[PDB]
Amino acid sequence: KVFGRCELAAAMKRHGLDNYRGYSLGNWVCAAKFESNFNTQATNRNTDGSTDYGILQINSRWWCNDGRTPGSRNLCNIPCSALLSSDITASVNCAKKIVSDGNGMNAWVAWRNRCKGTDVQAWIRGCRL
Ligand SMILES: [Cl-]
Ligand SMILES: [Cl-]
Ligand SMILES: [Cl-]
Ligand SMILES: [Cl-]
Ligand code: NA
Description:
By secondary structure, the chain is mainly alpha-helical. It contains four helices and three strands. Strand 1 and strand 2 form a beta hairpin. It is globular. The site of one chloride ion has 5 residues, from loops. One chloride ion binds near residues 68, 69 and 72. Belongs to the glycosyl hydrolase 22 family. It is found in: Secreted.
């Protein structure tokens, strides 16, 4: 599913993400924009053989099982394919675990390089939230 900007903002809000660990909704929508272009089915292979999945490009190295990342963990206790559903519940609940682990949203490279310190409220501007 390719979300619209405000559509995704409202879904993330419904699921607990706005202001989660202090990160305003615009930070999450910006991160999704640059990680996946709002496509729940986005995958990208990393040089080390792990793979990033879903709207927030969650990495099989630590967070989900795909059966093909030797030595990896599955800290969200999910198959990585659950991170590709049109329903964002599994991605949101795993992202809540990621953003609590110490480094906040710096876990998302696209957020640090393209959202951090910018006007992230622009990503929810005009949305009927
Ligand atoms: Cl915001
Ligand atoms: Cl594996
Ligand atoms: Cl949803
Ligand atoms: Cl933080
Ligand atoms: Na894994």
